[PDB]
Amino acid sequence: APSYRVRRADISGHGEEAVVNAANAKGTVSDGVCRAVAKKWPSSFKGAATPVGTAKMIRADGMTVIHAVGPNFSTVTEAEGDRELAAAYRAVASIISTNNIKSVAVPLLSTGTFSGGKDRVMQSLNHLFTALDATDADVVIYCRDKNWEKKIQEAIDRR
Numbered sequence: 254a255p256s257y258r259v260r261r262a263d264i265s266g267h268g269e270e271a272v273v274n275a276a277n278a279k280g281t282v283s284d285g286v287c288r289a290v291a292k293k294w295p296s297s298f299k300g301a302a303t304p305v306g307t308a309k310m311i312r313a314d315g316m317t318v319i320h321a322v323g324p325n326f327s328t329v330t331e332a333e334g335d336r337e338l339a340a341a342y343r344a345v346a347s348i349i350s351t352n353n354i355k356s357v358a359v360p361l362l363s364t365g366t367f368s369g370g371k372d373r374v375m376q377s378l379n380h381l382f383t384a385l386d387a388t389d390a391d392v393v394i395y396c397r398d399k400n401w402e403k404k405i406q407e408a409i410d411r412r
């Protein structure tokens with residue numbers, strides 16, 4: 254069974270075996286988690302382009318980087334976005350289990366740039382749990398907001 258905990262820290266300082274980038278489909282560096290990942294592991298972006306709802310892994314800069322493309326909720330219906338968000342997290346879980354990754358730092362996909370202006374912390378976290386429950390990985394969820402940290406911790410605890 255996987256273990257879940259939450260850190261309020263820059264994900265670029267994670268202590269896990271792998272990190273999930275909240276990526277865009279073009280594999281470009283822009284504001285958000287992606288900027289922190291590009292600064293710390295700059296060569297991890299080579300050929301990282303992957304369609305919405307998929308994930309693409311690379312070993313670069315002594316790190317395993319998993320580029321997961323959550324939906325942009327400005328560009329899909331709510332139901333379409335919810336399916337694509339579930340798919341991105343399942344693509345992450347498959348890469349974790351198939352590559353024998355023992356621990357992973359995970360941001361909440363589609364809760365920032367891609368949130369379409371809405372609070373999607375619980376939507377994103379519920380898809381994260383459902384997908385990563387298929388793995389044996391130690392999962393560390395990263396956020397920057399003290400309120401999010403407690404929400405996430407509350408949600409971890411309720412389980």
Ligand SMILES: Nc1ncnc2c1ncn2[C@@H]1O[C@H](COP(=O)(O)OP(=O)(O)OC[C@@H](O)[C@@H](O)[C@@H](O)CO)[C@@H](O)[C@H]1O
Binds near residue numbers: 396
């Ligand atoms: N350094 C950090 N450490 C820990 N948590 C962080 C972080 N930077 C941002 N976050 C949080 O991670 C979540 C996903 O944000 P993001 O805005 O990065 O994630 P999405 O909403 O999936 O959008 C991805 C796009 O921004 C895409 O173009 C990429 O360029 C960006 O990733 C948001 O809740 C942010 O508050």
